[PDB]
Amino acid sequence: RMLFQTSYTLENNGSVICIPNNGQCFCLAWLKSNGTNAEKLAANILQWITFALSALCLMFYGYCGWEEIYVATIEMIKFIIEYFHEFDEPAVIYSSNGNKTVWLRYAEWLLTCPVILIHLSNLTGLANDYNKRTMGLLVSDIGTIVWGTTAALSKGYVRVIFFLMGLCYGIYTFFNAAKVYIEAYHTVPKGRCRQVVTGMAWLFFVSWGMFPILFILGPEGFGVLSVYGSTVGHTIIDLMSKNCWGLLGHYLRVLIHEHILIHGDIRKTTKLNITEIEVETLVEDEAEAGAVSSED
Amino acid sequence: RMLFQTSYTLENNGSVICIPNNGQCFCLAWLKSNGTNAEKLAANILQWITFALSALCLMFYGYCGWEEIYVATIEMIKFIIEYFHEFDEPAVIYSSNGNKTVWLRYAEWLLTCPVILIHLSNLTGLANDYNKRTMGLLVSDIGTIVWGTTAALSKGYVRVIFFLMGLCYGIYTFFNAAKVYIEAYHTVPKGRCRQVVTGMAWLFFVSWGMFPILFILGPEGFGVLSVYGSTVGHTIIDLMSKNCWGLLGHYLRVLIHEHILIHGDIRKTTKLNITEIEVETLVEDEAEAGAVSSED
Ligand SMILES: *[C@@H]1O[C@H](CO)[C@@H](O[C@@H]2O[C@H](CO)[C@@H](O)[C@H](O)[C@H]2NC(C)=O)[C@H](O)[C@H]1NC(C)=O
Numbered sequence: 230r231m232l233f234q235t236s237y238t239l240e241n242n243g244s245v246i247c248i249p250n251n252g253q254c255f256c257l258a259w260l261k262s263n264g265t266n267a268e269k270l271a272a273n274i275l276q277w278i279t280f281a282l283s284a285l286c287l288m289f290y291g292y293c294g295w296e297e298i299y300v301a302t303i304e305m306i307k308f309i310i311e312y313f314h315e316f317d318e319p320a321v322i323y324s325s326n327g328n329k330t331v332w333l334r335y336a337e338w339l340l341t342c343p344v345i346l347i348h349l350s351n352l353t354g355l356a357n358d359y360n361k362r363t364m365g366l367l368v369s370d371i372g373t374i375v376w377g378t379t380a381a382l383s384k385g386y387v388r389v390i391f392f393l394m395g396l397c398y399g400i401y402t403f404f405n406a407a408k409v410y411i412e413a414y415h416t417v418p419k420g421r422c423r424q425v426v427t428g429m430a431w432l433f434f435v436s437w438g439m440f441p442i443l444f445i446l447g448p449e450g451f452g453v454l455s456v457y458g459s460t461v462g463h464t465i466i467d468l469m470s471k472n473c474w475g476l477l478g479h480y481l482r483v484l485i486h487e488h489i490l491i492h493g494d495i496r497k498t499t500k501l502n503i504t505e506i507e508v509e510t511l512v513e514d515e516a517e518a519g520a521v522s523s524e525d
Numbered sequence: 526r527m528l529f530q531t532s533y534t535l536e537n538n539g540s541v542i543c544i545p546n547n548g549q550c551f552c553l554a555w556l557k558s559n560g561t562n563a564e565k566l567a568a569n570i571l572q573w574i575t576f577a578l579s580a581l582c583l584m585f586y587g588y589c590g591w592e593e594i595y596v597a598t599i600e601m602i603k604f605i606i607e608y609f610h611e612f613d614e615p616a617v618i619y620s621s622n623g624n625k626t627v628w629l630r631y632a633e634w635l636l637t638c639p640v641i642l643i644h645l646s647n648l649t650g651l652a653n654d655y656n657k658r659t660m661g662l663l664v665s666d667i668g669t670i671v672w673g674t675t676a677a678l679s680k681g682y683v684r685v686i687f688f689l690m691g692l693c694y695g696i697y698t699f700f701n702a703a704k705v706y707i708e709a710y711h712t713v714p715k716g717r718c719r720q721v722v723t724g725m726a727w728l729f730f731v732s733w734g735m736f737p738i739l740f741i742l743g744p745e746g747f748g749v750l751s752v753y754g755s756t757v758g759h760t761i762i763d764l765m766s767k768n769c770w771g772l773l774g775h776y777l778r779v780l781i782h783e784h785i786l787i788h789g790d791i792r793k794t795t796k797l798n799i800t801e802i803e804v805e806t807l808v809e810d811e812a813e814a815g816a817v818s819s820e821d
């Protein structure tokens with residue numbers, strides 16, 4: 230069911246491979262098994278569960294809010310292609326140096342990275358402005374993915390160097406993402422909204438941190454994980470990274486907008502020092518509306 | 526000088542190909558010539574000229590301003606890799622369906638698209654804010670490149686569909702880029718700054734519009750252009766798209782910042798209607814500082 234040459238004869242005591250001259254590409258490297266049927270079964274179950282969660286989040290969002298729906302949209306399109314042509318090129322790229330590259334995964338990443346990072350820069354949903362920091366986040370994150378994708382298509386020392394270049398860009402991304410979540414926390418009202426921001430920070434850093442770990446573990450790295458192995462790993466962190474995070478995002482947004490519906494937009498001036506940063510703290514009391522220099 | 530199998534024997538009256546069992550990948554599709562030596566010579570000259578312009582812009586920027594330098598930085602790194610390994614994987618991806626994909630080109634695109642589009646959203650260099658429109662520009666443009674890259678790795682009807690999906694995202698990008706340039710024009714002072722904004726609009730739409738044209742013309746499309754042919758085409762629009770546009774950008778930025786040094790930040794309220802849009806028109810006269818509803 231591959232559309233490369235799968236049938237060959239070994240000749241001159243296996244020193245020569247003879248293949249039909251039917252125009253089809255050939256490489257023994259491509260024919261290495263994708264893993265055990267147990268690995269494959271586990272992967273097909275988690276994919277359906279991903280399709281189901283993608284479906285329910287979307288219809289739920291149906292009852293502003295564009296960043297969460299899109300990530301679930303891209304996720305569903307991904308599953309329809311996986312269901313029919315998961316291991317067909319170009320969902321997997323079978324290349325001249327013998328690599329298998331899951332282009333399907335990196336494509337989704339590039340597509341939704343602006344969406345996620347815009348949403349990172351808008352947790353409350355109140356802002357009509359994005360700071361200079363947002364822009365550095367997008368530049369660094371897209372570089373990360375571009376270097377990483379290059380590293381996956383490469384081998385030997387060239388793969389090493391592009392992975393290192395991806396890590397350098399990635400560090401810049403993580404550093405600046407951390408400040409955003411710090412500002413978000415001290416901006417939102419003191420009650421349930423700060424529980425949810427905390428929840429989203431945890432999901433973000435753990436799920437995003439697991440991607441370079443699964444790169445090193447997978448066929449693109451030291452080949453510890455098989456291809457089905459890698460798929461299963463990806464489905465777990467995919468569920469956390471996309472569906473769940475945007476669901477927590479929408480929830481937060483709802484809570485914040487309902488705060489404006491009841492108490493109204495009552496900002497403060499919490500001057501942080503984690504530097505000499507500032508923040509506009511939404512509060513439920515009209516009285517509270519002054520400068521609270523909370524030097525951390 | 527390829528690191529795939531280039532040497533084979535035709536057997537049973539060319540119906541069988543026999544290749545050494547040395548582990549190397551093999552496909553006749555990969556061995557198709559990249560073009561004439563005249564095409565190649567033209568490509569090597571325009572690449573050096575690109576390296577020279579990249580070099581001079583950078584040292585010139587050496588005498589805020591981060592978006593122009595970066596695009597020239599990425600351009601120089603690109604040339605060092607082209608010089609040594611232009612047709613080595615993964616600068617070119619030689620894949621199982623026989624395609625040659627110039628990953629080197631699309632990587633650069635993804636890397637600098639945030640940089641260019643942030644710069645689009647900051648022509649004056651005065652803003653510390655980016656509107657909601659900027660964010661739609663980045664989301665749509667990265668989708669464009671992701672669909673396009675998928676289309677280049679695909680064949681037949683799958684390539685068609687991903688190209689169509691790229692075009693839909695691209696239209697959204699062009700539409701919104703047009704509004705930005707309209708706002709930029711009516712924001713800057715009435716003299717030389719409006720000449721330069723006009724110059725950058727022309728370079729942007731012509732250079733960016735030529736990329737889907739060169740996709741359809743190149744090996745990724747109807748194979749009208751050869752690989753060297755495609756390289757030459759790309760060097761011309763590359764020079765316009767990157768070096769020249771950022772040079773015009775830096776020039777504009779200089780002019781605007783010098784306006785603050787002489788006249789100061791004297792805004793107006795030009796209310797456009799190309800809708801009911803608004804703009805803050807920098808003027809050289811302190812007197813002029815009111816609402817000028819110029820309904821277009
Ligand atoms: C043909 O190839 C076979 C491969 O199995 C050779 O058999 C083995 O020979 C090597 C010596 O290079 C030993 O290390 C192995 O232990 C041998 N047996 C097996 C089962 O692998 C065989 O020598 C080759 N024949 C000729 C004439 O070249």
Ligand SMILES: *[C@@H]1O[C@H](CO)[C@@H](O[C@@H]2O[C@H](CO)[C@@H](O)[C@H](O)[C@H]2NC(C)=O)[C@H](O)[C@H]1NC(C)=O
Pocket residue numbers: 538
């Ligand atoms: C071996 O292949 C050659 C390919 O050149 C065959 O020669 C040609 O045969 C076809 C018939 O299928 C004609 O259309 C061509 O005009 C022939 N000549 C050339 C120069 O192309 C040849 O018939 C095959 N031989 C056997 C025994 O199968």
Ligand SMILES: CCCCCCCC/C=C/CCCCCCCC(=O)OC[C@H](O)CO
Pocket residue numbers: 384385386388389390392393396399400403438441442445450451
């Ligand atoms: C802030 C986010 C937290 C997460 C940060 C993750 C840290 C990962 C670092 C690993 C370094 C180990 C080296 C990995 C470099 C990859 C290249 C490689 O495997 O090289 C192939 C080899 O040269 C030929 O077989």
Ligand SMILES: CCCCCCCC/C=C/CCCCCCCC(=O)OC[C@H](O)CO
Pocket residue numbers: 680681682684685686688689692695696699734737738741746747
């Ligand atoms: C706003 C920017 C202005 C620029 C906008 C550019 C317009 C380009 C449209 C071309 C449509 C023609 C069809 C191209 C679709 C590509 C798929 C293709 O070539 O299909 C292969 C075929 O099915 C098997 O051989």
Ligand SMILES: *C\C=C(C)/C=C/C=C(C)/C=C/C1=C(C)CCCC1(C)C
Pocket residue numbers: 337338341345373374375376377378392395396399437438440441444470471
């Ligand atoms: C689809 C949703 C998400 C959140 C995808 C995220 C992907 C990454 C965070 C990838 C990170 C990489 C790093 C940090 C460095 C190695 C190369 C990677 C692209 C795998």
Ligand SMILES: *C\C=C(C)/C=C/C=C(C)/C=C/C1=C(C)CCCC1(C)C
Pocket residue numbers: 633634637641669670671672673674688691692695733734736737740766767
């Ligand atoms: C390196 C600098 C620039 C400006 C690169 C730009 C690339 C494009 C504008 C590509 C556009 C595409 C479109 C509009 C649709 C087909 C697929 C493409 C990615 C080639």
